[model samples]
Target: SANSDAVTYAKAANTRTAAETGDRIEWVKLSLAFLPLATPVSDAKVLTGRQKPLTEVAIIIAEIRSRDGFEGVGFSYSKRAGGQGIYAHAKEIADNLLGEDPNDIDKIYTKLLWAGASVGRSGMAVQAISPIDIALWDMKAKRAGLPLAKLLGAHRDSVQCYNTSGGFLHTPLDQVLKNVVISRENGIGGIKLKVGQPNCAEDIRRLTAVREALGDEFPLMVDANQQWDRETAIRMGRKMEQFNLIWIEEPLDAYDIEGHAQLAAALDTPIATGEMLTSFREHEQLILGNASDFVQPDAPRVGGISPFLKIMDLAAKHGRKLAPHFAMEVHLHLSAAYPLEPWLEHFEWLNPLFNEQLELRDGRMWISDRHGLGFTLSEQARRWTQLTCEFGKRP
Candidate 1:
């Protein structure tokens, strides 16, 4: 590890650049808004074979802008209920940014942490803080005139990504197979199957179906969503091993380090978890304690980009791998920053809303050559979605 003197030198070095520009960066609380788009964001639904439905929601964001004329955008793609939380937490989070320098991402994130202390420092707070964090990173990168991957010191320009669809229990087997084929046709090499359904046997059959459809050579993984306990996870995990799974995600509670480590020893497949952790300490425990073979932190949920990049460094130190859970655009840049980082999780929930979707070519996510997150909310997306609450009507 670099000594404190080196750390101090780096921080001083970063501060001097902005000072030289003579431009003051201010973070203003932009009112969070939602606009319905032509296509709706979809998630898990419990439906019968070939009869699953896509429950789309409007696209929304908590945008951050710098007085220096640079802006960063952060969004939450949760279910409608979660969207309400996004809006509710927006003002509360934005309040923390009142007059903070946009360039001081580290200091701003530190301040937000202290302010959010009383509100049970996980889940909603982190989720709400997610977009803000990404926005800060984007602003920082733009100010530096560098791609996010380079900002994070990634070794490669492009990294690997895996396909993850099968929203909740709603998607039918055939529909799922088609989705995978479509995913493959789009140039994706790996695909993820959703598990944690009603019965383990049913889950097994579903996973098997995907393998059969994609053929034995495909890289298939499963997500339990923390729906199973140790005993069941062990039993079911053993069953999943026969299929040559790439990894098994969230086999236990994201907070349960002991259980995760224990499960890791017993299971052949890599035990991947970390989307739920919000701070460096939790990540420390997750990695050092042997809880996960691969870390999967959510960029927004881990309290934004400042800690996110640090967490990635932590993963590297422990000789573990990282695969961000969601926010593929941000993840793409983040992965780009860290080059040689493994696969990042991908989804379809927000694609219908974005004017530009990140392209997956040859089993990899290709970052748009454009600036920042690479795309913005399409007007079509705006017209179709709305803020879940109707409280602020016709003021």
Candidate 2:
């Protein structure tokens, strides 16, 4: 089993409250980029005839600059479609951020939601506000002269990290095994494999090979990508017990709270899910239902750090372990701040989108001491941009 460093956070004397800061948002910029992949990345969704393979990520980045010239950058992305919708909705709502205090993160987040209430607070409407919401937090942390984790009261300086980007179902078995060796060499603490083949036997065959390759203590995980029915999940989950996985991910649909609870209760291997949920309420339900042992929330997908933190608070209260779904750049800091020992995913796909790099050492991703998220956009991100907009004058 994975263990926590058991780091503790003593609230610092300098820790600031939610009091108003004088810095007003002077300018907000939005851009859309389609980052191409080396090849189509397929998973259980593709094998089950549900969704097509993923070729590129449609990312909407929000850059918020205050009148004092402090800048914060945040992004929200779609794997398949809806990039245009997030951009359109963000554009329609972003103008209101001008002249607003960047430190009033909660107030600004609520205001943005109501501004676009016609589209509601979940899914695409709130997703549009995600980048701006995240940018607000980024600006707040930078203004405080601390990393986001430090500003939030970090529990540990680093979080255990696992590899998933290299284990897409489309890769061949030999390549997958080689990726395991490479991942270990890279110092990743854990590895996950994609299961849920159309034929359950194929999944077992592949998993058996992976287990044999890694031996018994490698902290291996498997993701079904939410393709199985409850019965199928139970049956397949039972068969998977022989391999002694760390967790079975997304055994049921994202919204199948009861089904997940049943699967979690039925299996010896724990369930880890909630990545597809788009709102705090959905995750709250998952938590209260005891649907998962590990809550794999994606902050960007759940309306950015504001609501994401709320979900984390609820999860901590319920004693659930945190293993944020993706975006290690953002999650590394947040995971470091979690009340419990947490895990972060290391997906190298976003490396080209940023100017800085994260260091992996001794099975953990170290949190940098840089102010805010410690990331800036890259030249490739500029080249990938297809749409851009700006609101308000730069101060």
lDDT of 1 by residue, 78-142 (tens): 54445666667665656667556767777766677678777756667666777677777776767
Q: Please name the candidate that would achieve the greatest lDDT relative to the true structure.
A: 2
Residue 306 accuracy (lDDT) in model 1? 67
Cα lDDT tens digits for candidate 2, 125-220: 778888998888888899899999999999999899899987889999899999999999999999988888788988888889988988998889
Q: Which ten residues in a row have the lowest lDDT in candidate 1?
A: 42-51
**Model 2 poorest 10 in a row by lDDT:** 1-10
lDDT of 2: 0.89
Error of 1 at 323 (Å): 1.5
lDDT value, candidate 1, whole model: 0.69
Local accuracy by lDDT, each model:
0.69, 0.89
